[PDB]
Amino acid sequence: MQEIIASVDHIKFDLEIAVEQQLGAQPLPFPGMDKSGAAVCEFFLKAACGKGGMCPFRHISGEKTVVCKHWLRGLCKKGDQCEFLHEYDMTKMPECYFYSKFGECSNKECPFLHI
Amino acid sequence: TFDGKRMRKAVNRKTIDYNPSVIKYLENRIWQRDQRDMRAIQPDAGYYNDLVPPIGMLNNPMNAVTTKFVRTSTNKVKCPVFVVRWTPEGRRLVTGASSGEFTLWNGLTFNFETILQAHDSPVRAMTWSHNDMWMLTADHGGYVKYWQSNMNNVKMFQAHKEAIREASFSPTDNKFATCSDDGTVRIWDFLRCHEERILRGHGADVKCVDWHPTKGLVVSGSKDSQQPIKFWDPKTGQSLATLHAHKNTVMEVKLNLNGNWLLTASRDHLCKLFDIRNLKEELQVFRGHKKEATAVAWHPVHEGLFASGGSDGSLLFWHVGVEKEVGGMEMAHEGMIWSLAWHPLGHILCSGSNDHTSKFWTRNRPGDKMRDRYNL
Amino acid sequence: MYAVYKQAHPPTGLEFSMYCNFFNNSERNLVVAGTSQLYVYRLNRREKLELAASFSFFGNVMSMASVQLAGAKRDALLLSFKDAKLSVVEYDPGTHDLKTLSLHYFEEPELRDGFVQNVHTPRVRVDPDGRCAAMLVYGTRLVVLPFRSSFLPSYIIDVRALDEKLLNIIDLQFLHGYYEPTLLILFEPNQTWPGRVAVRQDTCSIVAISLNITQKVHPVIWSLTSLPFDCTQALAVPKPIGGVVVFAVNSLLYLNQSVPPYGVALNSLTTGTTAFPLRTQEGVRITLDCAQATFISYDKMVISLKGGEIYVLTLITDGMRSVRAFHFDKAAASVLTTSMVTMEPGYLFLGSRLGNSLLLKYTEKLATYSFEVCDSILNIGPCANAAVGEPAFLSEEFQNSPEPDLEIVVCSGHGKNGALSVLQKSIRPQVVTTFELPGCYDMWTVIAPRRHGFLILSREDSTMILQTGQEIMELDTSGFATQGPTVFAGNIGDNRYIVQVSPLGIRLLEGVNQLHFIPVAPIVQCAVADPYVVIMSAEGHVTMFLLKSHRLALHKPPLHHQSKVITLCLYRDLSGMFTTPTHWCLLVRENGTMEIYQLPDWRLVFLVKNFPVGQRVLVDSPLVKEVLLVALGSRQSRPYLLVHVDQELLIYEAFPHDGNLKVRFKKVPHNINFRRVARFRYFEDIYGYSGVFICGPSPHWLLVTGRGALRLHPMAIDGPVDSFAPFHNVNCPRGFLYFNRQGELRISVLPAYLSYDAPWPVRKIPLRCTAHYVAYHVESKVYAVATSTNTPCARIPRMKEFETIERDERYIHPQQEAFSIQLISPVSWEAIPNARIELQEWEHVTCMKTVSLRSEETVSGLKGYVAAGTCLMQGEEVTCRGRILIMDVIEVVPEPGQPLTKNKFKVLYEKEQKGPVTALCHCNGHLVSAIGQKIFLWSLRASELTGMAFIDTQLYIHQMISVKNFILAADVMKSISLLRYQEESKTLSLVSRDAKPLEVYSVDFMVDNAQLGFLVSDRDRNLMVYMYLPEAKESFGGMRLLRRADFHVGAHVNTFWRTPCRWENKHITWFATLDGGIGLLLPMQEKTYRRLLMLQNALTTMLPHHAGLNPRAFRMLHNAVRNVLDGELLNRYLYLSTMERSELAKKIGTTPDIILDDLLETDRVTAHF
RNA sequence: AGUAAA
Ligand SMILES: [Zn+2]
Ligand SMILES: [Zn+2]
Ligand SMILES: [Zn+2]
C-alpha cells in the first residue's frame, strides 16, 4: 500500500547516482584490506576499474565453485584473492568433513553437504 | 593438537542470550514512559521473561552488578591473559596473552572460535576505534599493529623501543597515543604511522594513557611519585597539569564518557575519582580493595557504575556518589586481574587474570539464593 | 535538508489530575494534564465532563500541583518541565487565558554533580496548609518555594548534606498535622535490585524534616531504617489519623511518629525478601507495583491496581485514633490508570494513558462501595503501529477523485484496554440521491406540520419549491413566491409558520398557503429569531418584525445612523451568560465597529471599535462579510461568534466577565482557509450532532457536543460547497443537503460508524488485548492484526526441560503472553471468524508487515503477502530462535449467513530459522530478514525461501525499511546502517552508517525531488535526518552518515508512513507518537525555509508564551543542525491580528501576504485522510 | 583452505 500511494520508481536519487558512479571513493590504505561487506566494482566488471588492487570495491573472478567457510564465519584474510566463493549459496557449500570421514555427522543443522 | 578434524559429540552449551531481554524491553517501551511505569520484577524464579537489559533500568544501575559466574574460558596452553576486549558489536571477545596470541570466544555461548599468533612478544594493549573499523594492539617489544574485523593484520610499525603498556584513539580515528616503559607518551597519526609529538616529563615508565572523549586531552599514569599523573595537549605536546593523586604506581586512568570524571587505580590499594574541571581536590576515594587495584572499567550504560579489579583476584563494583562498594567478589580470580571488559549491552562482564583463565560474569537472576562460592 | 514540523492530531492521554479552584473559589474543577496539553473540566449534573479550558505548552509537564496563595481569588498551578523548571501559572480573568506568576530555573551544572544524563523527573509537592512548595531536582536537590509578591525567595537543600545522607529518593510527601511543613522522604541509601536480594535484603528508609522557612534549618525527625526493599510510594494520611501509608510491591505499611509500625503482607512473595515484621492480610492476594491511590475519606482509600482492579482500603482504628488493622474490599474493575483524583464526594476520576480515562461514581451499598461509569474521555493510546488502508465504502460520486481515499488504523491502548483506532481526518458524506439542478445558487429547508416539509431554492430570476415527503417532487401550486429570487426562508413561531423574504417584501405562510404579505432599498439579508425577524437593505437600513398573536408586526428600531450597518445577525440566548430566553442583535458597521443590542428594546450593551482587525480578545467599548452568533454544547450553553473578513475566518468564544453585557470574546485558533449567500450554516441535529457548517473553498464541520470541545472536521471531497442545509426525511434520516460547484444537489447522511466528537473522526475497536502490529492487505482489502493476551506462567523452560512452578495459595504467578494474528474486515470492523493464526506457547511476534514478493502468477512480478517474524522467548539462559511466517489472504466461498467468512488465512511458508527473527522487510521482490547479528536476503519459491545474500550487522536490528535496492537498518544501541543489494552479483553490502551510538525507535525516509533523507526517531524524543554525502569532507569517503536536520518532538515515535503532497516529488512523512498524537515532516525549499525561519525567530522573541517556556529551546535537539521549522509556533502568526501581523512582517522585512502564502500552502498540501 | 568438532 505504501508503494501504491507513494511510489518512488520515477525518481532518480542522488544516492543512486553516487553509488553507480562510485562518487567519493578513495583508495584503500594498508594494501591487505579485506574489502568484505563492500559492493563489487561495476567499472572493473564492465570496462576497467582504473585503481587496481587498492580499489575499495571487490574485483571478482569467475573461477569459484565452493563457498568460503572462513567468509561465513566472518574471518577471511584473502579478500579478492580468495580461491573460494563469497556468495551465500547453500548448494555450493563445502562437503562435510565429518560426514565424509566418520560416517554420520554430529549437529542436525549442518550447513555442509552430506553426500 | 586441535585442528577441528576429530569427531566430537553434540552437547548443549550454556548461553547468556540477550535477545529475550531486548524483545521484552522493546515491548515495554511502547506503553511505559520511564522505569516508573515499569512493573516490578519479583525475586522469584518464575519471572525469567520479565528481565530487561541495562538500558531498560537506567534508574537502578544495581542490575548490572555482574556477580553470577557463567564460564571460565581457558586456552589449551595455559598462558596468562593481559588484555580482553569485546568486538564493537559484541559478537566475539578477543583475549591477548603473554604468548603473543589472540583467542576468539563466542559472545553468546563463550566457546572457542579461533586462535591467532598475533605478536612475537606479550600482548599488552588492545583497543578498537570509535568507528568500529580498526583494532589497534601493542606488544611488549614496542610494535603497533592494525587489524580489521576479519582479524587480518594490515600494518605494523615499532612505536617504542620498550614495552608499550596502553594505547587509545582520539575522538576521531586520525590520531592515537601510546605509553611505554621509556617514560614517554607519543602521539601518532593513524594513517601515516608517523610520530607527531613525544610527551616527556613523567620521569618513570608510563603504565597507562587515555584520550579525552571530546576535548582533545591526554591523561597518563606513571611509576614515580613525583609525576604520577600528567595532563597533555596532543596538538602542542606540552604538559597542562600534574595530579599527585597517588603515592604508588598508577595502574589505570579512565576518563568517563561524560567528559567530566577521571577514574584512577593505583598500587596503594585505592581507586579515586577526579573532576577534570577542578583538579585541586578529589571527588571520591573508593576504599575496599585489600590489595593493589590493577584494573577498572566504566559501565557502557550506567555512567556512575564501574567495576574494579585487584592483584589478589578480587572484583568489586562501585557507583559514583556511594561510599562503599555496591558489590564484589573476593577471590573472583586466583591472581592479578589485568583487564576488565563490559559487553556492549552491559549485561556481561569479562575479566582477564594473571592466572591463565578468562571468566564471564552476568547479572544475578531473580529468585536466586546466592549461596555459590563467589557470593556466600 | 529543510523541513517544517506540523501537528495533525493533538496528543491524547492524561498523566496528572487534580481537583482545584481553577477559575474561582466558589467551585472546584477537574484539571488534567497530558504531556504538552492542559485541560480544565466542569461536572454537569447523567453526569458529563464539560471542557472549560485547554492550553498548550512548549514543553512536557513532569509534575502538576496546586496551592491557594494569600488573598487569592483562585488556585495557582505548579508545573514542572524539562530537567529543573518550576512554573507558577494562574487563570487570568479579563482575557480567557493563563497568566504566569513566576518562573524558576535550577539548571545549573553544579547541581548535577557531574552527571550529564538526568534520569530523575522534577517532582513538585505542596504543603497541605499551603505554607510552602517543594520540588525534588536531579534526585539530590530539594528546592523550597515559601509562600506568604506571593512567593518568598527560594532556597535549595542538598539532601546529601542533611543529618542523614539521602540517596535514591523513591517518593516524598508533605505530612498532615504539624506546626512546620514536615516533608516525609522515602529513600534507599544502599540500592539493590530484585535479582540480588540475598546479600542486600531490605534497605529502605523514611525521614521527616521540619522545614523552618525563616531560619532555613531542616532537622530530621522520626527516622526509620529497615523498610522493605521494594517500597514504591508513600501517601500522607489525612489529619484526624495522620501518619503516612507506604506502598511496597508485596506489602502495605502504616507508619506514625508516636506509634510502632504496622504492616501486612499482600502475598507470599515476602517470605525470603524482607525481615520487616509483616502479618498476613487474610482474603487479599495482590501486588502494588504501579498503583494509583487516593483518599475518599479520612480512613478510606481507593486503590487502582495494575491490571485495572479497584480496591477500597479501610484503616481500622480504635478509640486512640491509632490504626490497628487494614480492610480490603475488591470493588469493580476499570481502566489502567496513570492518575487518580477525588472530585465532589461520590465522584472519582481515573486518568489514563492506556485506554479511555473515565469518571466514576461510587455509592455505599446496604463499609462497602459499588462503582459505575458515568463518562469517558476518548484516548488514542500509545500508537504502537499504524497502517494505511482503503475505506470499505465510498459513494460512487466520489470514485473519480484524483486524490486517493485513505484511512489510518492504529494499534492503541494496552492490555485490557488495547484497541484499534480507525482515524479519518475529513468527512465523507454518504450520498443517497443526487439532483442536477443548474441555476439555483442558494437554498433553505423548512419544517412543515420534526421532519422537513419544503425545500426552497433560489435562482437568478425564480424560486423553486420542492415538497419533501415520501418522495421529493416540485410544488407548482400557490403559496411561496416563485417569480423572483428568495433572500431567506425559515421557520418561526416554534416551527408552526414559514417565513419567506423577497427583495420586495416579507411573506408569512403556514404551509402551502400564504398567510399575509408585507411589502418592504432592496432586501439583501434577513436574520430570524423567535419571534423576531430583522431584515437589512442594500444601504444598511434595518427594520424589525415581531410575530404578534398570528401576524408579523413592524417595529422600527431606534438605531443611530452615524455609520451604516454592513451585516448583522440575531441570537437567542438560552443558557444565559448574556445577562446584563433573551434575544440580541450582533451588529457590524462600516467604520469597523461591532455592536450588540438587546432585541426587545434597542439599547446598546456592547461595543468594539476595531472588529475587522481580528483582536485576540474582544472587550467592551476590513470588509466584514458575514457574522453568525450561535450557542452550542449541552443545552446551547456555549455561544460562539463566527466572522468572515476579507478571505479570513474568525472564531470567537464567549466567556463571562464582570448596565453593559457581562461577556467577552476570545479568539479561537484554527487552520481553516477562506482562499449574498450565507457561508455559515447552523444545524441543530445532523446524526445527533449540533453545530455550524462552513461553506466556501474549504468546507468544514464545526461541531460542539456535551463534551464542550470544539471540533473542526474538513469536507474537502466533492470540492467547494456553495450552499448547505439540514434535511430530516424518511429517505434521509437526520441528513443534510449541499450544492457542489457543478450544480449538483446531493442528499447525504453522515456515515454512522465514526464518532465525530474527537479531534479526528474515530472508531475505537476494543480488542480486550494488546495490539502490536497491524498490516493492510491490498488484495482482499483486509487488515491483519497481531495481538497478545496474558495467561499465568506455569512452567520454567530449561536447556528442553520444563519445571512446573510449585508454590502456595498466596503466590502470584507471572504473566505469560500468548500471541495470535487475526483478520479484521473494514466493512463491519469485526474479527473474521475462523481466520486466526495461533502462535506457539512462548512465541512472540517481533514484526509483521505486508511484503511484495516476486511471483509468476501475476500480471506484474509482485504478489503482496503478509510476513511475520517471531522469536521464542524463554529466558536469558535458553538460546533464542524464531520463525518466518508468510501468509496469503485468499477468497473462499462464504459460509451461509456469514459474509465475513469469504476471507481466510493461507500459510505458505512457516519454518524455524537459525536464530531470532527480529526484523523483516522486502527489497525488489525479495524478503529481507534480520536473523541474529546477520541480515539475510531471501527469494520466495513455490513453497520455500532460498538464501541469496547475507551481511553481518550490529547488536540487534529491530527496524528495517527499503527503497529501490537500498535498505535502512536500525540497531537498539547503534544508530543506523545503509545497505545496498546488487542483483547481478547477489551482493549485499554496507554503504554507510552512523558512527555515533544512538537508541533508535523507528526509521523512515524523507523524499525530495532528488534528495533522499533518512528520518530517525530517538529515545530522547528527537527526530533526525541523515543523508549520504560521499563528496563531503565530514563523511570520510562516504562511510559516515551525516545528520542534516534536527528537531525535538516532545514525544516518542514508533511508526512512520509517507504520502505525496496534495511539491513535484516531495513526500510527507507522517508519524504517530506514543502519546497519542500525529505529526508531519514536510520537505521545504531553502528560500521559504529561510523566510519562515526569520518569522519563527520573531515569533519566539516577541510573544508571551504560556508558562514562560521558550519555543526555541524546547525544539532544540537533546552539534544541532536545526533545519526543521516548528509549524505549531508558526500557527501563532495566523492567530495574531492584522496589525500585529503587519508589525512583525515589517520587523522582519517582508510582507504578511507572502508569509500567509508560505504558511497556508503547507496546510494545503498536507490535507490527507 | 587458516582450528568446522576447543
Ligand atoms: Zn575497483
Ligand atoms: Zn574467502
Ligand atoms: Zn555435517
Residue numbers in the entry:
A (entry chain C): 1 to 115
B (entry chain B): 42 to 417
C (entry chain A): 1 to 45, 63 to 165, 183 to 400, 459 to 541, 570 to 640, 644 to 672, 680 to 710, 781 to 821, ...
What's written in the study?
We have determined the structure of human mPSF in complex with the AGUAAA PAS hexamer at 2.5 Å resolution. The AGUAAA hexamer is the third most frequent PAS (and has the third lowest Kd), while the AAUAAU hexamer has much lower frequency. The overall structure of the mPSF–AGUAAA complex is similar to that of the mPSF–AAUAAA complex, with rms distance of 0.58 Å for 1,656 equivalent Cα atoms in CPSF160, WDR33, and CPSF30. The position of the CPSF160 BPB is similar to that in the AAUAAA complex. The N1 atom of A2 in the AAUAAA complex is a hydrogen-bond acceptor with the backbone amide of Lys77 of CPSF30 ZF2. In comparison, the N1 of G2 is a hydrogen-bond donor, and the conformational change brings the O6 atom of G2 into a similar position as the N1 of A2, thereby restoring this hydrogen bond. This also allows the N1 of G2 to make a hydrogen bond with the carbonyl oxygen of Leu75, and this interaction is not present with A2. A rearrangement in the position of A1 base is also observed, although the interactions with ZF2 are maintained. In comparison to A1-G2, the binding modes of A4-A5 and U3-A6 are similar to those in the AAUAAA complex.
The PAS hexamer is recognized by the mammalian polyadenylation specificity factor (mPSF), which consists of four subunits: CPSF160, WDR33, CPSF30, and Fip1. The U3-A6 bases form a Hoogsteen base pair, which is flanked by Phe43 in the N-terminal segment of WDR33 on one face and Phe153 in the WD40 domain of WDR33 on the other.
